[PDB]
Amino acid sequence: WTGQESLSDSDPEMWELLQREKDRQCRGLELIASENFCSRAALEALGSCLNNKYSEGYPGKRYYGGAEVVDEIELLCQRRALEAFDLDPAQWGVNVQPYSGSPANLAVYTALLQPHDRIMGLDLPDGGHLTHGYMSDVKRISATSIFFESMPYKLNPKTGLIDYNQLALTARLFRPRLIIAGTSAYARLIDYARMREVCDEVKAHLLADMAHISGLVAAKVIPSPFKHADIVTTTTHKTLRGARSGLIFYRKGVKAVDPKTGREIPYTFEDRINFAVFPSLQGGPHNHAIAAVAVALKQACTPMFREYSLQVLKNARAMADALLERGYSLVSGGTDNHLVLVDLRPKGLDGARAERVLELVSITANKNTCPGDRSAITPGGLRLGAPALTSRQFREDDFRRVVDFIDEGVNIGLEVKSKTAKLQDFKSFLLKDSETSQRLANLRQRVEQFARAFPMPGFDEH
Amino acid sequence: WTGQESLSDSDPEMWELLQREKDRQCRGLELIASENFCSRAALEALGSCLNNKYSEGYPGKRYYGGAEVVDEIELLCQRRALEAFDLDPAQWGVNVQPYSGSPANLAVYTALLQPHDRIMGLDLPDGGHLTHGYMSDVKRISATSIFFESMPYKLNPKTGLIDYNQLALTARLFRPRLIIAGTSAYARLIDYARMREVCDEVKAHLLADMAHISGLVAAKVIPSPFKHADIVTTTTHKTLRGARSGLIFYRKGVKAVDPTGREIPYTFEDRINFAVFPSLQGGPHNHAIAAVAVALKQACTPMFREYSLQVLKNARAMADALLERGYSLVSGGTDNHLVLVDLRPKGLDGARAERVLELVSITANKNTCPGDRSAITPGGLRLGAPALTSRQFREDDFRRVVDFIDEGVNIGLEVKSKTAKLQDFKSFLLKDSETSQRLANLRQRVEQFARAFPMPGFDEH
Amino acid sequence: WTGQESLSDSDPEMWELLQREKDRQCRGLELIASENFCSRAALEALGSCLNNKYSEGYPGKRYYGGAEVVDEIELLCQRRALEAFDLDPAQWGVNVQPYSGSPANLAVYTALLQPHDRIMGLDLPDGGHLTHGYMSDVKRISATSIFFESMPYKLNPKTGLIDYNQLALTARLFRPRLIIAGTSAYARLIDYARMREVCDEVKAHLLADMAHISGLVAAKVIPSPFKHADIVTTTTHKTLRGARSGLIFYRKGVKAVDPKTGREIPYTFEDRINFAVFPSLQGGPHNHAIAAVAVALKQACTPMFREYSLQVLKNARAMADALLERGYSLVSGGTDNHLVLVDLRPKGLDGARAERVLELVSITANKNTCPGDRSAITPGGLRLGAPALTSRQFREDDFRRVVDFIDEGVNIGLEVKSKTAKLQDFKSFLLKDSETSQRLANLRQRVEQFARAFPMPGFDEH
Amino acid sequence: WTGQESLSDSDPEMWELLQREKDRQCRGLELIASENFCSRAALEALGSCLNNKYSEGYPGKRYYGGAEVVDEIELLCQRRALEAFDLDPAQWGVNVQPYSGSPANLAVYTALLQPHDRIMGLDLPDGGHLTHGYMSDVKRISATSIFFESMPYKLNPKTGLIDYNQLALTARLFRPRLIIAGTSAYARLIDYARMREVCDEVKAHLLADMAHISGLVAAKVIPSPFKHADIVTTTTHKTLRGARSGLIFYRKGVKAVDPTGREIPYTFEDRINFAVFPSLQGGPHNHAIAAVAVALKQACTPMFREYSLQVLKNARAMADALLERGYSLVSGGTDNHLVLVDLRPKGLDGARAERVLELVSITANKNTCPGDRSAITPGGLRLGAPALTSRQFREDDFRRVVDFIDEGVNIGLEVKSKTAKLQDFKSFLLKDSETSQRLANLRQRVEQFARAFPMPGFDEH
Ligand SMILES: Nc1nc2ccn(CCCCCc3ccc(C(=O)N[C@H](CCC(=O)O)C(=O)O)c(F)c3)c2c(=O)[nH]1
Ligand SMILES: Nc1nc2ccn(CCCCCc3ccc(C(=O)N[C@H](CCC(=O)O)C(=O)O)c(F)c3)c2c(=O)[nH]1
Ligand SMILES: *Cc1c(COP(=O)(O)O)cnc(C)c1O
Ligand SMILES: *Cc1c(COP(=O)(O)O)cnc(C)c1O
């Protein structure tokens, strides 16, 4: 045994499974807003010898030896990270060691806050992520809610966007030490300046969780939260089109002046953020992911990537305006970023019913809770994203077509919800009813044949 | 732009770095015991299309859709996770989604324990990990020591082993809810039966953090902590020779019969999984999860049975070689993949030997010894057989590795006679062109010896 | 030494100090809303041999012996407590061991809640007590805020009373487990049914801190929170006119039915409340205070006590309507209980300035934060109470006179605030300025000579 | 209605109870060591006009007004609090507002420690108080064990003393922020110098909870914990013979000189006071605060010097009497006011002797012994000299108290030969008219002996 055998000539059970997921990725229309296809240049460094390296610590301050080469990859990933977002290395640092998006946020709380200190983050069914703190009125779901006390701020259920005033009201009563301006299902921009006004008012911290919009900020197509936020976290997938990892952008340098001494008051963010990642929470960094990220950060400071993000924005509206003009309402009026919040309630169906139908014809989205919803097991609305398919060189006409696929798929279950009872009934007929079974195999063949001829990034075979 | 351009063309600055580390791994003797060389088959799955698949949830109970294939992968990994450790699927479950070993341990604590519940783990200078609760004399270091209250147990310095008698005495006053039977710098076998008794007495859970010995347990060359623990965390790298991920083995099914006849169940499966997701993590790194399942399939094969059994013979060969050269070994010798060396007799300290051996491409790490306070320059080295054994090293090769080490020791010994402080020491190695030469001739001799050995994984990166 | 010597023939330094406080109590107009004069029948049991008895535990379940007589005093204080508030001993219990008002509340949180569980209580400057949780936007003041996370609910600064809607808003976001409907500076009643609606809505507990209004509830003159609250705490002084102690009224019996089994679901309040007091928080009960309380609870179920509370209510309005018709505004319109919230802002002065002036002429009140206030060191408004002087057999004409004393005292500092700068200046002139020094010695002589001829309760000499 | 009617007229039901307890106190032998008889002068201040004075704050810094007189009282109490323990007013402050001893201890913890910080106190079955953190095998009992994490230290069962060597060994692993040097059922002197060294080594605060020995310390008949502790909590009852309240003595002024020359201060005065109010308590019980100052003035007088010195001679007289009658004393004897008795040799258990002695008006309490688990019927009694010594008891009187005790022991011994369980035992004492007689003749003999002794306080209530 040499360890250099192929994955095919050794483990075929896994190799066929790899190609099936590749075929499934290629034959399908991926509309998960947080999904995206990675470049082969990044995947090559992901499956590299850098996986065989323990580099616990930070460059110049390891607790081992032989970290001489990985110290140049972190210090480069750090440079490329600040490069991609136009950040002076005198006002900003970055921690490239977070394993993913959730471990990145958990490190920031652990760094700045104390256990059970107060946190405000957008409520989860109001388009938030659970890493912002999610208590389910029965049990504490996210570890953010367990180790720290979290109170959510909500949407205005009429306007459909962030109630910057009720949040500006609760912060004075709740006196939090950290407010998280970041989303996972919200189709508008965010005023990262009213948040900073609320944060400066209640002496809190403004954390920017710019995941989902990571690339749009790097390509300068939407406003950058670094203008008025002091700590910015993000993942490396979603939009930045890299491998699965996380980042923590913290502001360094000088905070202000001693108005009566003239002494320098420094930003004390750095050494706390760096300490929380290691040694507190993590151990051996995934250096093979740091490289695959630095690769994707390089190809993010490039004009090729701005054309990508601009197409992503244009493909969002071209999916919204197409969906608007077909019998569908758009939460928050329409969109302003990469994803759209479809409301299926003014259409007689829901995200839970449409998904399973759409999921069965190689079109992948997810359910979503809209303001105009009534429960949880049947949420009214879907989450549709652009960056996934735009990487296959999708255009406005290419997206107005999958809308014609969606509406041609929504109106398949719409004749079954009017013919069956609940979710367990809905899905049951979709699999044996030959009038609907064969009705799906037509759309699946039409969806696969349409999508499979688009240039998928990454390796050809896996 | 297609996203199918190679890295060698798209980004040369990074591609030139993959070769600098691939050469450094190929040209150096790797003795960091927590380090192994992942196979090419597993590394292929690491950089696969699975990086583009958000599959939040668990096979079946998943939030999104389209996980029809990655469900079969995670279910194949869960199947191969148990077969490697000979676990009955009706008595054991496994969570294959921990991003690494540290997030695996934090998931167990978050699942079973409320915040500020009590955990006991071996002290860090005594051989324990950070994730077993390390608390400095002034600050809370590990996050386990922050969201939970931790008290460590110590070695018996006279024997270098875990003092299972002081643990039992201290665990009755501290009354923890979880005691951890995992180590990093421990050259001996853990008395898991003695641990469970203590955990039983004080109504606590026994956690086995077998990250260092996971491959030895899988090949059944050492006793298995599954026979005495009910929660087993492990890393998929190290002695398992896989991609960087973590696994949580737990018990399920009938706990015991009620004294009535009621069937008391196990309550790990649902708390453990809920802690990993949605509580702590999120999108499962489906590429590592698949790359892990490749390494697990190898661990079920006789090649691993011979590899792991060779890892033991090479540690003894490394241990006996140091002993015959007048080296003190903590606990006298070794029963696994590790060899703890005590350099205080020979006259050097681990901080100096780590620098010299590093300059000749012999990667080890300094280790504290039973006795000297943590506020002291360490007088010990931690050596590991897993890495080079994957490069087909054998018994006669580690006696040579010890020979190269001893020549490196006698250099820092000569330099220590010439150097005063430590920061001065790390300059005399780089400036004094008489010792700068001596290190170059040992570096070259070492690299020539190492390059001739095969390296698992890709050839160029 | 026999231990039976008099306090005079042994410690005269303390005896003269005792009589001076007695003379100070008699010669002055006490307007602290939480103060009151105790009956000699209670003070006799307070300084009794019951101080020499350790009775840790509860009747029938002591951990000593010889508690045979104190077991009959607790079981009687328990009976008299439920008697005074018309409570069926099958639906209600009481813990008579709380040392005071603050230790009573701290026991209820410790009993029902977990550390860092969530608590909502009326904000302190909005007429609350700190035992409801008071964080000062810098440090955690009350131990309620340290051991549990507290978020306050505020007053409507226009209406001047409890914003039952903004509280009904925050409870859904904050998801507390306990809301405290009790006041220390609020002149209206409290809807102990909208609170219970908010508590049943967010699955919280309704704690009634009926201190300040303890006697008014016992005399049936104002609504009783026991109608819709499940845990009721109170002190024994303030209105109930007893010794310094506390009480914890908890509901026992059956909570509801198992609608699918018919089994009894019991109120699990009792054994937690009893356990938190002993052994958790306290040790040896002050049996000499339990007796002095049971004495005052006896003389509270009597028609003599209803005449008292009715005079207290009538003396409040007769102080409000008198203050209204003299150039003073009343927060919350007027009053509805025992105390009035004077607003000195529409009069050019404040509670901090008036107090020190009033305090210097044997008239004792305190500062108070009204909604229409601008800071903290100079709060605009005073807190005036009835139960203190009403125990000296005060009538409406007797209270309209001290208002004529107050307004004749307010307009003494009103010529000094218009002649001095801040608080440190204000008080400084009051002590050397012979034009104001002698101007006070006239009012002090007129206040002392007026008040000293009223029947003070308690011992004649101390 | 004037509020000046006497209790004898206003409420007879309660007045008839003040006499039933006054008679029971006068007619019984009081051996509950935490129990003394308050003087009449202090009891006069207890039921005074000061109960009608809300004086929130501290002398000067007070919220309300009109506290011009109660300020002089609290300042007189603070002056007499220090003079009783010979404390320099420039080195020590005192908070005289704790409602009792338990709220006094909680104030110290809340002031100095953050929630879930670590406290070490003597175990409750070993002699410690609840407020030193008692944590059952299943539940958190004391509130100290809830808002803080507590680990107890134990006695050395071979010697009955505190094992100061296991404390130092366990305090290095637990690393507490506060160690408590207070006891309830401890018949010996605490090595406060050995405690402070341990607190110094692990960077912890030494708390002295001298509630039981406060009067002995005030009279300088035993070593003073102020000479080694920096926070001293105490009750104003027990050996101090005052009303029920608690005091917190702390250090202030210069801590030490900085190694520079900076003057490092003490940070207790402002944290301690803020914890008592506004953090924890509210309206100071000004009646107890004044009644305390009367008891403190007595503690500065030679009468207390003779009273406390007599309390010691009477405990030895009680100890030596039990020894000469074949009784086992925990730790062999006594050095204070207490005498711990071990009834396991004689054949009875503390739960049975407490019932028999209670039925003859000899009030003691059962005490666990070094050895038997807390889940066992206690085989020991706790006896105290403070109470009866206030009734002018002397050495020859306690030998008689032991004689009355021994006759009571031999009754339960005869009953134990006749009784099986314990709930049966407490019925055979009440039904069997042959033993019902035997207890009546001992009860009468005891009460006649006791009534002849004077009783501090009022005559009728
Ligand atoms: N037996 C055993 N061997 C190994 C080999 C590698 N590891 C993995 C972890 C390496 C060391 C953990 C660590 C990492 C960082 C610090 C650290 O930052 N300390 C102070 C901060 C205190 C202050 O700021 O006061 C400082 O340096 O500033 C530490 F104190 C220990 C282990 C292991 O975990 N256990
Ligand atoms: N050395 C020493 N002597 C004395 C003499 C009096 N005291 C003062 C305190 C008396 C005992 C403390 C206490 C008080 C109550 C319990 C108690 O409630 N236990 C369980 C609850 C557990 C469950 O419910 O599982 C139960 O009975 O139900 C206890 F377990 C100990 C002391 C002292 O503190 N120390
Ligand atoms: C998706 C997301 C995360 C978590 O990403 P993971 O890789 O699953 O950890 C965190 N924050 C935001 C805003 C996200 O959208
Ligand atoms: C290596 C190791 C871990 C995990 O380290 P990570 O790099 O975070 O995966 C956990 N416990 C022990 C004992 C280990 O050796």
Ligand SMILES: *Cc1c(COP(=O)(O)O)cnc(C)c1O
């Ligand atoms: C005054 C008050 C208290 C506290 O009374 P204390 O005797 O000082 O402990 C508690 N709750 C309320 C509503 C109060 O008015």
Ligand SMILES: *Cc1c(COP(=O)(O)O)cnc(C)c1O
């Ligand atoms: C008696 C005592 C206390 C206080 O008990 P309380 O009745 O609450 O005042 C505290 N510590 C010790 C050691 C005691 O003996």
